[PDB]
Amino acid sequence: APSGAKLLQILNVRVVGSGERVVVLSHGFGTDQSAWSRVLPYLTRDHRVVLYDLVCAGSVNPDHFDFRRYDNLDAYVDDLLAILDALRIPRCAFVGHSVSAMIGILASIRRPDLFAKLVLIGASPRFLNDSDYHGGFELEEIQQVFDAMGANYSAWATGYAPLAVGADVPAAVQEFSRTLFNMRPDISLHVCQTVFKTDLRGVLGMVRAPCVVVQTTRDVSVPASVAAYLKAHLGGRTTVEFLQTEGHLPHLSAPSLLAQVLRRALARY
Ligand SMILES: CC(C)C[C@@H]1NC(=O)[C@@H]2CCCN2C1=O
């Protein structure tokens, strides 16, 4: 199990920007840290920005993927904390998309003094529907996703990428498709299974950090009522920022709009 030190190289850690305020950018499913490329220059004039790849990214050597360890999001949390501890960063804001929003929630419970603020993009505590809980998916829907991913990964990714982007932004579709195709198909399926089975509803109240939940007008994996649920149950002061754009990947499809929200959220913490 690589130390935080060795993880700095394995997970392609980069530190850029200037200033005292540290911000971690943690990418979502199907991308790598290049997904932050379009929004990054809106932060680096006056924030010190830490970027890294999740172990499941195609830009990480697939020989490092451990199918036992990473069948729970707690192992991804371990990696994040090991990087921050290796970098000797005692306090930061954290921006997470998708699975990284879940990682950030869990990390803020594991190490409450380390996270001054959480910004969650495309975030859900639970995708499966439950009693009086609308997450957006039934068990048979997620099973069909797994079956499609395993039977024909290329065809599944080609159909999924425009749905995830949502808006008619062809470069965003191409960029998301490229990193989706860069993932090894068995690792992609494994991460998808891990995310779809996670249920964080019972620990949201243990988050102490103030939070900004960024929600678009239509997100194929996150109903608007799930953003409200996060605001209702997160333990810190929480604001939902509604972005006037469609899709699950606003950092790819609407970076200037997302940047305005991020700069307001990261101005003071
Ligand atoms: C059915 C569609 C509206 C949802 C979409 N489909 C998918 O296959 C991917 C799998 C990961 C998240 N996904 C999604 O949210």
**What's at 269, amino acid-wise?**
Y
Instruction: Kindly give the distance from the C-alpha atom of residue 183 to the centroid of ligand 1, in angstroms, as a whole number.
Output: 16
Q: Does the beta carbon of 99 lie inside 6 Å of ligand 1?
A: no
Question: Distance of CA 205 to CAs 19, 105, 157, Å?
Answer: 32, 10, 35
Q: What region does 58 belong to: left with phi over 0, alpha with psi -120 to 50, or beta?
A: alpha
* Ligand 1 midpoint to CA 163 (Å): 8
Q: Is the CB of 87 under 6 A from ligand 1?
A: no
H or E segment at 185? Answer: helix 185-197
98 labelled binding-site residue: yes
Phi–psi pair at 175, nearest 5 degrees: -70, -40
How far apart CA 188 and CA 198 sit, in angstroms, is: 16
Nearest Cα residue to 30 out of 148, 175, 183, 162: 183
Question: Domains in the chain, ordered, with CATH?
Answer: 4-265 (3.40.50.1820)
Q: Which method was it determined by?
A: X-ray
Nearest to 223 by CA among 200, 198, 240: 240
Q: DSSP 3-state assignment of 100?
A: helix
Closest-CA residue, ligand 1 atom 13, reads: 221
Hey, which of 149, 160, 197, 226 would you mutate to test ligand 1's pocket, going by the most ligand atoms within 8 Å of its Cβ?
160
- Which residues are bridge partners to 17 per DSSP? 48
Which atom of ligand 1 is found nearest the CA of 148?
8
Nearest ligand 1 atom to alpha carbon 127: 15
C-beta of 196 in contact with ligand 1 (< 6 A) = no
> What six digits make up the tokens of 63?
């020989």
Q: How far apart are CA 167 and CA 151, in angstroms?
A: 27
Report strand pairing: 115-121 vs 238-243.
unpaired
Say how far apart CA 146 and CA 142 lie, in whole Å: 6
Residue 256, CA distances (Å) to 40, 211, 214 in order? 10, 21, 14
Cα dihedral 214/219/221/223 (nearest 10)? 80
CA-proximal residue: ligand 1, atom 8 (nearest): 145
Residues with catalytic function: 98, 219, 248
> Distance from the CA of 76 to the center of ligand 1, in angstroms?
21
Cβ atoms of 190 and 67 within 8 Å: the answer is yes
C-alpha closest to that of 2 among 60, 88, 73, 72: 60
Largest CA distance in the chain: 48
233 in helix, strand or coil?
Answer: helix
Residue 156 identity (one-letter amino acid): W
Long-range contacts of 217-220 (CB under 8 A, 24+ apart): 217/242, 217/243, 217/244, 217/245, 217/246, 218/166, 218/246, 218/247, 219/122, 219/166, 219/247, 219/248, 220/163, 220/164, 220/166, 220/247, 220/248
Is 145 close to ligand 1, i.e. is its CB under 6 Å away?
A: yes
